[PDB]
Structure formats: C-alpha cells, structure tokens
Structure 1
Amino acid sequence: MYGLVNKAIQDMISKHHGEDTWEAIKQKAGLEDIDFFVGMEAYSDDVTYHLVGAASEVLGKPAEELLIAFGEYWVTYTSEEGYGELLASAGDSLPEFMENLDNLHARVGLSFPQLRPPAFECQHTSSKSMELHYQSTRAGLAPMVLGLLHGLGKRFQTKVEVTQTAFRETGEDHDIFSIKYE
C-alpha cells in the first residue's frame, strides 16, 4: 500500500503509545533501516502486514483490534494531513458519504496511480439503515472498515451501529455490513 497508510499507522501508535514503543514495533517488523515512509510511494502490502503483526505482539492486542482503532484514526488523520477538503466534499451525512466513497477513491486515484481502492456498494433498507457491501483485492481489512464507519459516525455527530453479517474469511462471496444510524 502507499506509504501514507504506513505513516498513519506509525502516527497513531507514536501518539497513543510513544516512540520507544514504535521503535520496538519498527524493529520487530523488520524495518530497522527505514528512517521514514514516503507518503506518495507504493510499498509492498507485506510492509503493512508486518507492522500490524509486530504491533500486535508488542502491544498485546489482536491485529483486528488495532485495525478497528486505525480505521477510526484514519478519518481524523486524513482531515488533518492534507485531504480535509476532499473529505468534506464527499458528504454532509454518513449515508451520503458512503454513497460517495467509490467517487472519493477515484478522485484519490488521479494523484495515486498505483491505487488498488476498495469497492463499496450501498443497499438502503430504510432512512435509518443500510447494507454496505465491501469488495477488495486484499483480505482481513473488514475490521478496519468497521472502524472507519464509526469514525464517520463521530465526524457527522451521528450514532451508528455496525454489524458484519457476511464474511469472506468464512466462505461468503464478499464482506457485507448491516448499518443502523440516526
């Protein structure tokens, strides 16, 4: 993935758990010789997976838990590190934002040519609920999607309840989320 993602991981853990802890994760992940991640360069997905693993072993939290936290963190990070205008343009409510999400990533992909973005489709089942379908080239990011949804809930001062109802990991076609909102 693009170094932006790894910068953001680094950023979250350094603020929440300090630099000594990050140094350890950096060491344990096998990236002692990398001074900094370059935001607009594309790294192997391995680098992100080894960071999450090393972070899980250092922090003693399951990877999937850190994915939830990093999903939420990513909504604040992107607003503050040069994509706040783009975020705001994607909508004024949780449901409008999710409808616009493929569009946002298309806009991102102009400037990030090696982007493998996620594919999102919304089924609106009421004015307070929807089914969100998530398709990806990558596995195991469903917990991150859950965190992102809660961050968008906080962003739009909106109560939100998310439950994953279909699991690629369990042999369904693709990840599906049932979402309820104010």
Structure 2
Amino acid sequence: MYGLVNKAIQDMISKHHGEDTWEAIKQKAGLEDIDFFVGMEAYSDDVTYHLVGAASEVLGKPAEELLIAFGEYWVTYTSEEGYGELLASAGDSLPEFMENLDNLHARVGLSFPQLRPPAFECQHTSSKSMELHYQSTRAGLAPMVLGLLHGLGKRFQTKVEVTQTAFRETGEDHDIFSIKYE
C-alpha cells in the first residue's frame, strides 16, 4: 500500500499509546530498517499486514479490532494530510459520498498511478438504509470498511448502523454490508 496508510497507523498508535510502544511494534513488525514512512511511496502490502499483526501482539487486541479503529481514524487523518478538498468534493451527505466513491478513486488514481482501489457498489434500499458491496484486491480488510463507515457517519453528523450480511471468509463472492442511517 502507499505510505500514507502506514503513516496513519503509526499516528493512530502514537497518539493513543505514545512513542516507545510504537517503536516496539515497529521492531516486532520487522521494520526497524525503515526510519519513517514516505506518504507517496509504494510499499509492499506486508509492511501494513505486519504492522497490524505486531500491534495486535504488543497491545493485546485482535488485529480485527485494530482494523476497525484504523478505518475510523483514516478519513479524518487523510482530510488533515493534504486530502481535505478532495474529500469535500466527494459530497455533503453520507449517501452522496458513497455514490461518489468510484469517481473519487478515479481522481486519487491521477496522483497515485499504481492505486488498486477497492470496488464499492451501493444500493439505496429504503430511505434510511443502503446495501454496500465491497470487493478488494486485498484480503482481510472488511473490518476496516466497518470503521470507515462509522467515520463517514461522524463526518456528516449522521447516525449509522452497520452490519456485515455476507463475508468473503465464508466463500461468498464479496463482502456485503447493510447500512441503516440518520
């Protein structure tokens, strides 16, 4: 993934648990070489997987929980690190933001040539409900989408309840989320 992801994890861990913990997570990840992450630089996906696995050990939390928390932190963090305007352009309500996802990724992919964006398909099901189909080149990140949705809820001051209705883990073609909202 691009450095920005890893920076965000470092920053989420650092603010919530201080620096020496970061550094131990870092060493346990096998990442002592690497001095700092470069935001626009492509890294191997394992750097991120190993960061998450190592934070899970050091902090005594499932990787999945850490992933939910990352998903919550990620929109706010990117909005403050140079992507504020861009996220603002993707809309003024949660459902408008969902529908703009693909066009947002098209714009992001101008600046990040090797972006592998996930596929998001949104069905507006009832008035306070949506169904979100999620397909990724990466495995295991459904809990992050959950947290991200919560983050979007907060962004647009909209109450959100999210339930995963289908899991790739059980052998379904893709992750599906039912989303109920304010």
Q: Same fold by TM-score, threshold 0.5 exceeded?
A: yes
Cα distance in structure 2, aligned partners of 1:145 and 1:97: 14
Cα distance in structure 1, aligned partners of 2:22 and 2:104: 31
- Per-residue Cα deviation, 1:109-168 (whole angstroms, up to 9, x for no partner): 000001100100011111110100001111100000000000000010000000000000
Matched with 2:101 is 101
Cα distance in structure 2, aligned partners of 1:108 and 1:28: 32
Cα distance in structure 2, aligned partners of 1:102 and 1:11: 27
Cα distance in structure 2, aligned partners of 1:76 and 1:19: 21
Matched with 1:126 is 126
- Per-residue Cα deviation, 1:76-118 (whole angstroms, up to 9, x for no partner): 1011111010111101111010000111111100000011001
**Are 1:39 and 2:39 counterparts?**
yes
Matched with 2:61 is 61
Q: How many residues align?
A: 182
How far is 1:17 from its partner? 0.5
Is the partner of 1:37 in helix, strand or coil? Answer: coil
How far is 1:181 from its partner? 0.4
Cα distance in structure 2, aligned partners of 1:78 and 1:117: 16
Cα distance in structure 2, aligned partners of 1:146 and 1:59: 21
Structure 1: gaps (5+ residues):
none
Cα distance in structure 2, aligned partners of 1:125 and 1:83: 30
Is the partner of 1:169 in helix, strand or coil? Answer: helix
- Per-residue Cα deviation, 1:7-46 (whole angstroms, up to 9, x for no partner): 1100100011001110000010001111111111110001
How far is 1:74 from its partner? 0.4
Cα distance in structure 2, aligned partners of 1:142 and 1:5: 16
Is the partner of 1:42 in helix, strand or coil? Answer: coil
Cα distance in structure 2, aligned partners of 1:169 and 1:107: 30
Please list, as runs of the form range in 1=range in 2, the aligned pairs for 1:78-93 lying within 5 A after superposition.
78-93=78-93
Identity, % of aligned positions: 100
Cα distance in structure 2, aligned partners of 1:2 and 1:101: 18
How far is 1:75 from its partner? 1.2
